[PDB]
Each structure stands twice: as C-alpha cells, then as structure tokens.
Amino acid sequence: SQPRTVTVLGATGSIGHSTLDLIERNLDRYQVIALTANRNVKDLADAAKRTNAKRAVIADPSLYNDLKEALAGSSVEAAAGADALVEAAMMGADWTMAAIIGCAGLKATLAAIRKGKTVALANKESLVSAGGLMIDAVREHGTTLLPVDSEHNAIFQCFPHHNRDYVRRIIITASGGPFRTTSLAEMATVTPERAVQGAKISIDSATMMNKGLELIEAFHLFQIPLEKFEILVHPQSVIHSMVEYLDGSILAQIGSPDMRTPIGHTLAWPKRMETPAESLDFTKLRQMDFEAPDYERFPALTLAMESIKSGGARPAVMNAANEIAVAAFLDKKIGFLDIAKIVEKTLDHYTPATPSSLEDVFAIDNEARIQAAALMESLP
Amino acid sequence: QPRTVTVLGATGSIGHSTLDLIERNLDRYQVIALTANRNVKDLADAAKRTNAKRAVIADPSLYNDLKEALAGSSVEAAAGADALVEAAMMGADWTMAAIIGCAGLKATLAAIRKGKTVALANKESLVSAGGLMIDAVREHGTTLLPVDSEHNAIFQCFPHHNRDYVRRIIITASGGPFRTTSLAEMATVTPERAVQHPSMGAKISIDSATMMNKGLELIEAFHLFQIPLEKFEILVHPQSVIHSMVEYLDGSILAQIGSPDMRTPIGHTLAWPKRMETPAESLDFTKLRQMDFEAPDYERFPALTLAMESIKSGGARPAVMNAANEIAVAAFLDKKIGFLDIAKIVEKTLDHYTPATPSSLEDVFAIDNEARIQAAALMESL
User: Fold this and answer.
1) Distance CA B69, CA B64 (A)
2) Which of A282, A283, A289 is the best substitution to test chain B (most B C-beta atoms within 10 A)?
3) Which is the most buried residue in A18, A226, A336, B97, by most CB within 10 A?
4) Burial profile B359-380: b = 16 or more Cβ within 10 angstroms, e = fewer
5) Is residue B38 helix, strand or coil?
6) Which CATH superfamily is domain B1-148 in?
7) Residue of chain A with shortest Cα separation from B163
8) Which fold has domain A295-380?
9) Where does 1-deoxy-D-xylulose 5-phosphate bind (chain B)?
C-alpha cells in the first residue's frame, strides 16, 4: 500500500525519539505530516528535515524565530505555540503518536482523538487526569486508541478486544523499584540521588506510585471492574503484564525492555513490523521471580486504588499532588516517605467536582497543586 | 441451535476432560457420537448421560457388552474399526480426535475430511502422517485446533494468516526426570526407575525421560504452524508453567501460561473462536515464586537431534522414527536393551530404512509396520 501518514506530538523526548527511529528506519512506508517538540528546536528541525516532514511545531512561542531559522530554505513549515500544537494534531495524519507530556499535551491529544483515526497514546495525564473524557471521545469518534507504555501495551497485546467479559483478571507486573527489599526505616532517610539512582518517573517507581497510576490508566483503557486488576511484583521486568481468560489461560507479553517493541506494535497495528529490539535470551535470564506487592511499605498503591475506586476527580487530584510532592523531595524539602503523606493529605482536603471538560481538568490540576504545596509547607 | 459434538476416545483422560466441559453446557452442545477402546462401562454411562446418538466400542469383542449396557436407552451401539470411522463421519460440527496410536488415524482423517472443526489430540496424525493430514485440512477447509499443552499454547500466541510475523517459536520443555542427569548415569537407568512419576503410561514416561516426547512435539509443531524449522527453539523450563511462546518481528514475545489442567487448552478448542469458562485453577504466581530456564542439551538427549534430522529430511522419516521408538521403548521396558540404547536403535533404524514419502494412510501403516520390524531386527542384533 501507499505510504501511511504519521504525526508525532512530542517527537524529541524518549518516546518520540524511539518513534522517529522506527519511522526513519522505515521512511519508505511513511509520509510524515507534523512533528512537535517543547523546546528542543535543534532535534525538532533535524527530525523534520530527516523525514521530509510537512510541518514542525515548537511549543514555546519564544522559540519560533529559532525554528524558522533552523528550517530556513527548507520545505518544512514552521509554527509555534500551544494553539499550533493542536492544529498540527488536526492536520489529518492516519497515525498519531501522542507523546507530549503533562497537562500541556491534553488539548492536542484530544484533538487527534476527535479526528477518529489511529492514536498511539503515551501521554499519561490523558487517562489519569482526564480518563473519562478521553475515552468518551474515543468511543464517540470511533478512534483506534493504542496504548504505548510497556505494561498497557503488553496488556493490549493479550487482551480480548470486543469481548471484555472473557477476562478474569489483568496482572500488571512491577519491578518493585529500587526499594523493593528496603525497610521503611532505611527508606525514611534515602537521598534523592539514591532514589533516582526523568527523575520524576524514577521516584514514582521508588514509591510505586507509577503502578498506582498505571492501574488507573489500565482501568480506563480496558474497561473491566477494578477488582479484576492485580499488581504482581516481578523483579526482572521481562513479563510486561498478563491477562487471564475465563478458561484459565493466561496470555503474557514478554521481552527485552526496548521501547521500540511496544511503539512498533502500535505503529504497525493491526500488522506487525520488524524492529531492532533484542530478542530476550531466556537462557541468559535464567530465572524469573514473583512476589506480592507490599501495600504496607508502599501506601501509594493503596491511595491510587482508593482514588480510582472513588473515581470522580480523585485520580486527577492524586496525580497533581504527587507532582508537587516528588519535586519537593527531589529538591530536598521533604523526606522520601513524606511524598505519599502529602498526596494522602491533599486527597483528604480537596475533593472538587468531576470534570466535564479539559478546562475543568486544568482547573483541578492547578488547584490540587496549590493545595499540595500548602500542605507540603505546613508539614510537621 | 445446539452445536453438535463428537468425541473420539471419550474414556481416556482427554475424553473425560472434554466431557466435563460438554456436560456443563448441554444447552450449548449436542453429542452425536462417543467412542472408546475397551471401557464399555465408562462409554455407555457417558453416552446415556449426554443422550448421545451413537456409542462405539473399538474392540469388536466387546460389542455385546455395549449393546446390553445401552439396553433401554436411545443410544445406538456399534463396534469395530470401521464403526469408528463411520462415527467420525456422522457430521459433528466439532470433533475431539482423541483416539491414540495409528488406530486413530483413519477416524481422524475422516473427521478432518468433513471440513468442520477438529480438535486434534492424536499424535500419530501429525508425527507420522503430518503431510497428508495438513493436505486434507487445506483441501476441505477444515478448522484444525491442536489440543496438547505446548501446541495449544503456541496456537493462542500465533499470528494465524500472517506466518511471516514470526521470528521464532519456543517450545518449552520440563526437561524430564533426568534433566540434570549425566549421560554416564543415564546409561545405568533401569525401567523401574525410569517409569516413576508423581498412573501415567510407561511409554509416556520413557519418552519424557529420553525427551523423545519433545522431539515428536517439534515434528507436530512443524506441520501445525508451517514455519521454517530453523525458527524453532526448545527451551528447558522445569516448572512447565509457561506452556510455550511465539516471538514476533517487533521483539514481542507472546506466551501462554497457566495451571496444568487440560480443560484450559480443551476449553480453548471447544469454544474457539470464542472463549468459555472452565473450572481450571488460576495460576498463583506468588505461590509459584520462581521460574527457571536453561538451554536444552542435545548431547545428553540425542532424541532431539533425531527429531530435527527427521524433519529436515522429511518424507517418511518422522513416521520411521516414531515406529522405531515404539519398539525401542518396549525393548527397554522388557529389559532387552539399556536406557541409552533407545535413541541408538531409533537412529540405526532411521539410517537403514528409508522408504518413499507416504501418499496415503495405507502407506503410513506400511511404513510403521516395516519400521517396527526393522527396528526389532536391529534391537536384537545389538
């Protein structure tokens, strides 16, 4: 078939870079429409020229002239600003990688979703903070939503789409983070350098908040009762997640950690494509371990469950407070164990009404951040 | 309307597990024929329970017992080899082919030729007559669903209609009871020790010990999935919880994992393309705690190499290998040769008897017969 049209929102980050690596490696199969970046003008212009893209968009209006210059004498169109990001997402690409991080990516992601084509979703806030809204748009416009993160993609590959009732349970595997075998006592005094040893994501892995967030996203993605989800600690992180069917059969997605595997799955879907991802060598792996997550040592897991269980704006508030707490820890303003405490406090004192639009989500995120900062400061 | 089902070999373990699922869904399934080999009692009871249209006992000598057991019911009674084939041709939309040995080839092929759905458990069908069986499937648009653990696991992770997406198929293997035993010690293994297991047939136990069972599984997999032999890998995994895997071109490896309950793979073939609930236990990974993996040892288990070479050569080799193994294993159990002589006799037979590729089941039977005689001759010469 003719070249497929593709657009990458957030083309210079880790996910974006891995995406472009695959697109470039198979440029003969793709027609790049738009690529966007936040402030990385150099890598953006390079990616655009490297794929003969129709348009390149830099998020910060301040960098517009720089982008134009980098694209001087090029057929590549240059644009900038938040509105331009949304316009790029509406250019018509059949396949869109939504990898702009944060609430800043919500507008463009929803816009792409509303186009009703294929959207490979990497942005976490879309489902954690605006899950109901995003999934509503997906269903309304017949969009093909393909999850990009490791666990979600693994689940998707083992999930009976169009027959959710076939699922008995979904198992989200977790490495357990750097403190899987660390006592609360020694955890209380870990330094940011030891915990991250992006930092934010690393810290979420340490507190296990990342799994709580993954749980929430999976709930929106697969639409099955919360009680059917299980978190299983698996140190090696080779089994990326699993799905058990009513007949007892458990389908699992296993492999090397190369992100080009899940990205490649979403890019080729419903087909399959070659990627340079290494083939997992089980003989060298030798062993796989499994154990129950310690809810006592990582209260973040419980907060996330209670949040999604209650629904409404709880998840959005939780996610927002965590952003504040994590940054505070990384800035040595609080202790490691204070992160989950600040998130919990925030959830307790701030319970806004459920969002009806992204504007409401933006409002909730901003307020929760203010609330969290206040509690973080008034911490005894 | 109820889906019609026939179970060939309904009294063995597979048959019992198959009936378990059928009887929990009599509102969904209508039993046409049920067959057994010598267990008239079990056959008759099952037939009467499921209100089967016909029950066939393989052994002609037991025809009278069967008729008496069915007296008063509406279940038709039949017996003999031909009756099995006829039962398989009664028209069931779903047929469980579980008659073991070459004695199940005729009925299995007959069912396949009807072009509906056939859940395949009989091993000789693909080990000895793989080419013919797959040809029959292609000719009649038959839906062939593998029942055994590894094959069903592969099937659930396989890109049907897109074979080129496969990079490799990993057949997991427990490694058998002698997984960590040296060739030197294996040389001394006695029949009494080799058959020890946690009922299971002695032959099954020996094939597990020599890993011939794995070699045969590889042959079957080769015909079932139609991908290049070099794309197959055997991976020793003691726990046997991962039942097999398939790696795709993007690096993704899909695996089927679960408890050992055969109702899971059977349930999959019975409900296909849908899924049905079964009482199979949900694998508890926390209790499991650990999974181990290691490379197979082709030096210590030459049966694996023999299987590989037989497939590469194709033709009648697999059938010859299977028949020779039957003789060799029996000889070992009868204490006429040593444990390691089994694979040696098989190897010798494969080199000495090289008939033409089978063109019909009649040729397969002839090859099986001759291979058995040649193996026996070699077994005694040794």
Assistant:
1) 9
2) A282
3) B97
4) eebebbbebbebbbebbbebbe
5) coil
6) NAD(P)-binding Rossmann-like Domain (3.40.50.720)
7) A272
8) Rna Polymerase Sigma Factor; Chain: A (1.10.1740)
9) 123, 149-150, 174, 197, 208, 213-214, 217
